[PDB]
């Protein structure tokens, strides 16, 4: 029952001691980013000591859904104590452990190797912890952080884990309130578990083959189309093309998918993702069928000194077919 004290300091503790050593954390937040304020009316009010959770089905409906936000504000920030302290008060008083332990999990995880990673651990309950999580028995029954491989593994072979991850950093990006770390922990999680899903599903019978990508589609296209299109954050986009690539370079797909991957991209990029984007689109039509769609070409050639760029990357990728797909589909 808290993320600081052991519990013989907590059982002790009233809520206004907690209170006021919690808030002082809040506040510094709020002086490091003004959205963190408008939860001073709401979780950090000081009303909130008094407040009881059991004692109002849409009320905790919508206290469930002021923490979801809150997790995904601060998830930022977990190296600093003042984080550390706000979430404290919501584990004391609101008990988020327990009515919120999936988002919770999630806006912890890509920190799994800082201590408080371990003492969160240790203060869950087991049969609370929802089931794409349970790789963690191990480590709460040990107090050990899982390293970065067990929870690539876990996500390579777990649809329900990938998924769980590609959820919550799509919701903190449609919220804009993504940060470097998330983005870098969801890219390099996806290119690993999807590079790992390819190894595990190469056959060498044309029909299980294709059943296999049909299936792997299924899981990670949707993910995928969402991220590349999700023009305020650059970095979620640029990452989903180097997922894609992987796909392109290494997965034995079909040429209608590789298509759909080709105006998804020219669909969502924006001048910040061009060159990356013109990377990826040149993989996707090396890995391909010889002309290329209406859609792609319109957009391709809106590239500012195009044939310089191709030029470019020709350093280190194989350009042929997609300049050869322009040129063929001008018609």
């Given amino acids: ?89 919501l584990i004391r008083r609101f008990r988020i452990h327990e009515f919120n332990t999936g988002t919770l999990l999630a806006t912890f995880l890509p920190y799994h190797t800082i201590p408080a990673f371990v003492t969160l651990l240790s203060i869950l309950p087991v049969q609370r912890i929802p089931i794409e999580y349970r790789f963690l028995d191990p480590y709460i029954k040990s107090l050990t952080p899982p390293p970065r491989a067990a929870i690539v593994q876990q996500a390579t072979n777990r649809p329900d884990l990938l998924s769980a991850i590609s959820r919550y950093t799509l919701d903190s990006c449609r919220a804009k309130q993504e940060y470097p770390g998330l983005i870098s922990f969801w890219g390099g999680i996806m290119a690993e578990a999807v590079n790992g899903m390819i190894d595990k599903m190469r056959s060498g019978r044309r029909a299980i083959q294709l059943e296999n990508d049909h299936l792997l589609l299924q899981q990670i296209g949707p993910v995928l189309s969402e991220a590349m299109v999700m023009k305020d ?99």
């Fill in 1 to 89: 029952k808290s993320l600081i004290w052991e519990p013989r300091v907590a059982v002790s503790q009233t809520f206004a001691e907690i209170y006021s050593q919690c808030y002082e954390g809040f506040k510094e937040l709020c002086h490091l980013d003004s959205r963190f304020v408008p939860f001073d009316a709401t979780l950090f009010s000081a009303q909130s000591q008094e407040v009881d959770r059991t004692q109002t089905a849409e009320e905790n409906a919508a206290l469930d859904k002021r923490v979801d936000s809150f997790l995904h504000l601060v998830g930022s920030r977990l190296r600093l104590m003042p984080a550390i302290k706000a979430v404290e008060w």
């Fill in 233 to 331: 954050v650059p970095g979620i986009q640029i990452a989903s093309y180097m997922v894609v690539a992987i796909l392109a370079a290494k997965g034995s797909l079909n040429d209608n998918i590789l298509t759909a991957f080709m105006e998804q991209l020219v669909h969502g990029w924006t001048v910040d993702t061009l060159r990356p984007g013109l990377v990826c689109l040149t993989m996707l039509a090396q890995h391909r069928a010889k002309q290329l769609s209406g859609r792609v070409a319109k957009a391709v050639i809106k590239v500012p000194d195009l044939v310089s760029s191709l030029r470019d990357i020709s350093k280190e990728h194989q350009v042929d077919k997609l300049a050869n797909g322009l040129v063929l589909a001008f018609v």
